[PDB]
Write a protein that binds this ligand. Structure first.
Ligand SMILES: [Cl-]
Lengths: 4, 316, 310, 4
């Protein structure tokens, strides 16, 4: 969902 | 219900943050806000595929409201002129931009005041927000799928109030055409950075909806369509249709801005052009994409804010 | 071997496009060239962890070639000064002069018993500056730089190279790069956007972390502290990471958590530099070396980075 | 390995  | 805000008995307030982290983007997947969004996106896609062949010189709907939402885009379009950009390197968000948004955040509430008739003004704070957030980031000096998503949201709101009776694909064509005219002009003048951009691993730096719309328009004609998906690869033909069709309009805009061989810089659109035999496929595929690549990704959706009127954070 | 070149008995030729598609990016993964790249990657990285506190107004190494190559970087720096803007159309123009004058300048740089090496070198360095025609810069150009300094290493041009030189060299290189990007308005070449590490660079941040890695907890900054604008500013001549993050800081406008979510994440998450370094390497092999949009334009000669198996 |  969100960059890591 | 996915389609009509229960006007009168349903209360509005200023929308507020709700997407925060990974889970929060996921709970959003099941919200009433989203089912409305996906619904109005379906409708406008379905509608627009009636308009394969829009009037490039069209000026007004027969619906009052497409004409107001037209005229208010018009007013905030005049604003760019009043906000000459700052000299210097054409490389990042050009600073003049903060100013334009200050001016916007000042007469928008007025301009929607006039636009909706009396009885509705108690809708503005919610509406204000969405339209307001349609044109790029206030302080990042960017613009991407998330705001484009916000404009569709504005319209869906106005729609949810039942002020687009019998809206034909030509009305969707007309409002978005002005919308993209403006956004094309903002991106170039304020020299804006992309937001939520997935780089060379995304559809387009700023847009996705344009393409789902463009593609829809030729959906129903595919074999008898003035161009094939293969052909948007031809700078000359794209130009020929860039007024009649959002997909050409999109591709034309990449083409203007970005410098290399098209295949190196827009690899996905390239693959589509070379791989999807027909527009009805592209659109099916570009819709599936939207709901992954925008509706489920955080950098892209976290600035969707929820009120209690149009796009509530309640479950299903 | 990863390390030397059969000089003079391996032959050298103008590099030539080799990575074409998904298939051939996966072959490349077993090329001599790739291991020769990975090998020097490690080298510079561990060397530089020797150099947490480099002389920020050092000019000259004690090694012959690092001033020679310094001097070449310098000869083309100067080229910019004589090629003003209106990506930016003045720029193909700059690249044009780079290839008129560059084979020539590497002519002086090496011993006359070496000239056979240029077409190949010529290619690798002359491409460390972003595309002739696409008007972009990205990590494949950065990887090209390293590649070049590796060619030199491989002719043993650099005996007992020290961290401090692997600084100095690179530190100069980026100095030009920050310049070329702004003066030319060069776009991001081959990037993931927000889903990538930096619009333009990945090595700055490996080196960057190396340096502070050995001392981690006694490092002047900790990894969460890159998020403070002035602490970052203090270190940016002396530490590549801060230089990296400084650059972002003076170019990208919103909150940092918002426009470089990945670097943010690192900084809020990875407790110690050695681990930050460890990650960025692992990630350099996925995100740069196995990504075709990024390596496609790494061409292969017969002599330095050859397109053959193991 | 490549966007598609
Ligand atoms: Cl700021």
């Amino acid at each position: 969902a969100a960059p890591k | 219900s996915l389609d009509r805000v229960d006007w009168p008995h349903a209360t509005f307030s200023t929308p507020v943050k709700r997407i925060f982290d990974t889970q929060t983007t996921l709970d959003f997947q099941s919200s009433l806000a989203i089912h409305r969004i996906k619904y109005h996106l379906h409708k406008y896609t379905t509608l627009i595929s009636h308009c394969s062949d829009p009037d490039p010189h069209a000026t007004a709907s027969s619906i009052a409201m497409v004409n107001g939402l037209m005229g208010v885009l018009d007013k905030l379009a005049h604003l760019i002129d009043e906000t000459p950009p700052l000299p210097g390197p054409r490389r990042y968000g050009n600073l003049a931009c903060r100013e334009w948004h200050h001016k916007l955040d000042e007469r928008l509430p007025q301009w929607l005041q006039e636009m909706l008739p009396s009885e509705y003004h108690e809708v503005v704070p919610e509406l204000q927000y969405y339209l307001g957030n349609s044109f790029g980031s206030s302080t990042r000096l960017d613009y991407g799928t998330g705001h484009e998503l916000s404009f569709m949201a504005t319209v869906a709101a106005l729609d949810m109030l039942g002020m687009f009776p019998h809206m034909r694909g030509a009305d969707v064509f007309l409002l978005f055409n002005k919308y993209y005219t403006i956004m094309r002009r903002l991106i170039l003048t304020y020299t804006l950075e992309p937001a939520g951009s997935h780089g060379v691993w995304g559809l387009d730096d700023h847009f996705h909806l344009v393409y789902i719309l463009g593609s829809s328009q030729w959906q129903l004609l595919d074999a008898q369509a003035p161009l094939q998906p293969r052909e948007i690869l031809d700078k000359s033909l794209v130009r020929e249709y860039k007024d009649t069709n959002f997909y050409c309009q999109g591709i034309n805009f990449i083409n203007e801005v970005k410098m290399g061989p098209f295949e190196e810089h827009s690899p996905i659109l390239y693959d589509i052009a070379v791989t999807v035999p027909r527009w009805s496929k592209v659109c099916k595929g570009l819709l599936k994409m939207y709901s992954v690549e925008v509706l489920k990704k955080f950098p892209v959706v976290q600035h969707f804010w929820f009120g209690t009127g149009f796009f509530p954070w309640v479950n299903i």
